[PDB]
Each structure stands twice: as structure tokens, then as C-alpha cells.
């Protein structure tokens, strides 16, 4: 549950393993499920273990999902494994300006 009076930035992740074998080795057998809940957001995640194109040697992927939790609101992680949990939440400080370039700073 969010304490402060600014919105919260929550981020979690799912580990789509290289194969059902690795997924069983890590989180046990049986279908895996991660439901994420919130007053303004509700979704269900099921990992799809498969041998993706081998990026740098590892065929397994970890994807990240995010939500903004308004003040005095609760987020509920019900899960069964294959969950990359967060330790800290993020709170935006003020205002800023983002750019993209390769040129030197001055």
C-alpha cells in the first residue's frame, strides 16, 4: 500500500525459461501463474517457456511490467513462481527534461 501522496512506480518481471525442464528445476512443476492486482489495474501473467533465438547464449527471457500506484492504494502480487520480485518502489522527485544525442556535454 502506498504511503506518500505522490504516485508510486512498481515494476516486476516474468521469467520465460528456455524450456519446461528449466522452469520445473527453478520453480517446480505445475502450471505457473502470476496475477497482479490494483484498484486501477488488474492483469494475469502466465510464463511461456520456450527456446527463443539464442541472445548471447541464453534462450530464456525476463520481461518487465510496470504500474503507477496512486496514494493510499494497494497492489497485490499473487504468484506461483517465475516471479522477479521488486525490493524498492520508485517515486518521481520533480520535473526534468529528457533528450537523445551523441554530442558532447558543455
Amino acid at each position, epitope marked *: 500500500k502506498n504511503t506518500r501522496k505522490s504516485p508510486a512506480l512498481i515494476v516486476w518481471g516474468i521469467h520465460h525459461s528456455v*524450456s*519446461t*525442464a*528449466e522452469q*520445473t*528445476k*527453478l520453480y517446480g*512443476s505445475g502450471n505457473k501463474l502470476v496475477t497482479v492486482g490494483s484498484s486501477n489495474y488488474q492483469q494475469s501473467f502466465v510464463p511461456s517457456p520456450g527456446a527463443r533465438p539464442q541472445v548471447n547464449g*541464453l534462450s530464456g527471457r525476463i520481461d518487465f511490467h510496470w504500474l503507477m500506484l496512486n496514494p493510499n492504494d494497494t497492489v497485490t502480487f499473487s504468484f506461483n513462481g517465475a516471479f522477479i520480485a521488486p525490493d524498492r518502489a520508485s517515486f518521481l522527485r520533480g520535473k526534468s527534461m529528457g533528450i537523445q544525442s551523441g554530442v558532447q556535454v558543455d
Partner: antibody
Framework: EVQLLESGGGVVQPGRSLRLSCAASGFTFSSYAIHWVRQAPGKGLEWVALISYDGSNKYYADSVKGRFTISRDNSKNTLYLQMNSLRAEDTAVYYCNGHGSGGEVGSNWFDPWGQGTLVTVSS | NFMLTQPHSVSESPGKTVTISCTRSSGSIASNYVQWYQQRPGSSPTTVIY?????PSGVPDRFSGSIDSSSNSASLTISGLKTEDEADYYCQSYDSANRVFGGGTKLTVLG
């Protein structure tokens, strides 16, 4: 340099008890889970027991439940198998064998075995 | 829950290829990893294959692992047999946390 040292083997009678120990040296013992795997003479391998890296979980074979009790001392890097209420069939060579991911998922294959300690149970 | 059945014995001439099967009685062979162990007489077992096909550092290229989901089996195959290979071989898979060993397969190279 990595090695496992099984000790406590000998001849016993049925109905009695026994205790086995494994001395680990050469790796981070506190991180891997450890297994007891035996093999009767002329027979094949049989997984006996396992204990987790932090001793929270202990898993025993269905053919040995109730009698054997696994334990570990990480401060001493020692494994213990309590074989009370022995039977005639438990006669076998007893290997301690480390088998676990150890917190890493890349995890080059790490599965060390000892030399095995003979446990003869004749009448 | 399940048992791993492998043939009691097998033999083949040196230089020829040989394969050993490991059939799981209940449950998909792809559900849990399968390790292939080699045990020489008197010696402690040494892993030849892990995670169905992975060759640990030291094992020559002759050893290969395979999975046959159709017959729900796992096969360890050696090409170009050598008399050193004459040992017993055990396949091992996993029930939920417990390990399960095969019945053993005495591989003798023809002399």
C-alpha cells in the same frame, strides 16, 4: 581441492542405529544442497536423501522414510545421516554427493561425489 | 510416482556407435531434467551428460544426449566406442524434489 569425505562406516546388526558424516572442503558448502546416494553391491545406484542449503527442507526416499534423518552443520561444513532402525537391505556403499544450482542459473555442472563408505548389515 | 527403465545390458564393436535408452513410466520426460552418469567398477560415478544434452568440461565429443518425447525416453549415445567406455551407465531424473535413478545398463565393448 574440492572433495567430500565420508566417515562412520562399518558393520552393524539389524534393529540398531548408525550415523554417517561427510566433510566438505574446496567449495562454498553453505550454498549448495547435499545428497546421500547409496548402492548395494552388484546393484545400481539409489538416491537416499537430500537436505537444502539452509537445512530448511529435508527430502527422504520413500524406501527409507522414518528411519533415516538428514542434518548438516554449515559452521563445521559437515553432513550427517542418522540411520537408526536399520534393516538387512540397507547394506550398501554410501556416497555423499553435492547436487544443486547454488543460487546461479548459468551454473556450469557442479556435482561432486565422494569415495563412498561401506555399510554392511549382516546378522 | 514414476520409474526410469533402461536396458540391463548392451554391447557393440569398437569404433561403432551405441545408444542407451531411458524410458519414464509416468510423466513427461521433458518435465524434469535427465542426467547421465557413468560408473566404472569400484570407482565413484562421474557425470557424462547433464540437462539432456550438455557435455561437461572433460567429456569427449563422442558422448551425446537426446530426448524422444514420442517414446518418452532419453538416449545416451557414444560414437566411436573405446574399451575405456566399458562401464555401467545410469540415467537419473527428478520427482518433485526427490532424485530417481535408472536400473543401470552394463555396456561392454567387444574384445
Amino acid at each position: 581441492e574440492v572433495q567430500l569425505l565420508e566417515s562412520g562406516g562399518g558393520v552393524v546388526q539389524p534393529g540398531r542405529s548408525l550415523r554417517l558424516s561427510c566433510a566438505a572442503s574446496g567449495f562454498t558448502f553453505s550454498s549448495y544442497a547435499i545428497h546421500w546416494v547409496r548402492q548395494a553391491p552388484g546393484k545400481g545406484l539409489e538416491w537416499v536423501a537430500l537436505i537444502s542449503y539452509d537445512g530448511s527442507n529435508k527430502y527422504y526416499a520413500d524406501s527409507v522414510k522414518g528411519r533415516f534423518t538428514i542434518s548438516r552443520d554449515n559452521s563445521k561444513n559437515t553432513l550427517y545421516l542418522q540411520m537408526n532402525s536399520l534393516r538387512a537391505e540397507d547394506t550398501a556403499v554410501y556416497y555423499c554427493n553435492g547436487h544443486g544450482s547454488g543460487g546461479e542459473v548459468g551454473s556450469n555442472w557442479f556435482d561432486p561425489w565422494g569415495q563412498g563408505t561401506l555399510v554392511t548389515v549382516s546378522s | 510416482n514414476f520409474m526410469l527403465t533402461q536396458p540391463h545390458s548392451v554391447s557393440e564393436s569398437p569404433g561403432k556407435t551405441v545408444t542407451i535408452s531411458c524410458t519414464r513410466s509416468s510423466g513427461s520426460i521433458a518435465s524434469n531434467y535427465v542426467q547421465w552418469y557413468q560408473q566404472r567398477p569400484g570407482s565413484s560415478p562421474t557425470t557424462v551428460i547433464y540437462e539432456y544434452n550438455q557435455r561437461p568440461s572433460g567429456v569427449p565429443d563422442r558422448f551425446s544426449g537426446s530426448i524422444d518425447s514420442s517414446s518418452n525416453s532419453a538416449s545416451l549415445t557414444i560414437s566411436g566406442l573405446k574399451t575405456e567406455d566399458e562401464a555401467d551407465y545410469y540415467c537419473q531424473s527428478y520427482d518433485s524434489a526427490n532424485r530417481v535413478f535408472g536400473g543401470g545398463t552394463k555396456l561392454t565393448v567387444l574384445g
